[PDB]
Design a protein around this nucleic acid. Structure first.
Lengths: 114, 111
RNA sequence: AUAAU
């Protein structure tokens, strides 16, 4: 119950469902640091990964073709990888709180009628 | 996954019987009629199962089921533990688990 | 023999 443990969770960014919405720009923010704040606030690490995550389509296709394990993620769908390293109770709580906080960044059409 | 679909999480928590061989962790977890562990589950919105060597009321029977090699009893070859399970959308599933893991700590200190 | 599942 006391030792640091690692957890990781992929969250799909629904680009197919909402192709007109710029999820990456919305995640990173107007100055590009919104995701940095979100991480520091939640005590997690968050990385935007998958097809489209590099904002350089030539380079992305190059790294994917290399077969280096660092870039395996580029085979995947666009997503945020949330990672945490803390004792079990804190690790799960942090993840729960990060997953909650990230929801607003990923739903263009949230309900606003009752 | 998508942020909305129900997901399953499971976490084993070791009961430190080796460290504290004199202490009845199982009785402490269950309480009278199992209502301690039942309450703890209901409060945390988790499922909890006590599993592993030492889990069963009955040491003769335990050894029998272990020897059967039925897969439902494989756990009896493992160390004593609580398996905490949850099924809910990702943010709620992780929160529940974090809260269960916090609440269970006091039961895994002897006195 | 705190004994749930």
């Amino acid at each position: 119950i006391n030792k640091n443990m690692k957890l990781g969770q992929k969250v799909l960014i629904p680009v197919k469902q909402f192709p007109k919405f710029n999820f990456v720009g919305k995640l990173l923010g107007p100055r590009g640091n919104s995701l940095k704040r979100l991480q520091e606030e939640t005590l997690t690490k968050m990385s935007i990964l998958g097809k489209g995550s590099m904002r350089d389509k030539a380079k992305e296709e190059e790294l994917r073709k290399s077969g280096e394990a660092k870039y395996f993620h580029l085979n995947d769908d666009l997503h945020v990888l949330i990672e945490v390293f803390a004792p079990p109770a804190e690790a799960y709580a942090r993840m729960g709180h990060a997953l909650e906080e990230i929801k607003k960044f990923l739903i263009p059409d949230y309900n606003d009628e009752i």
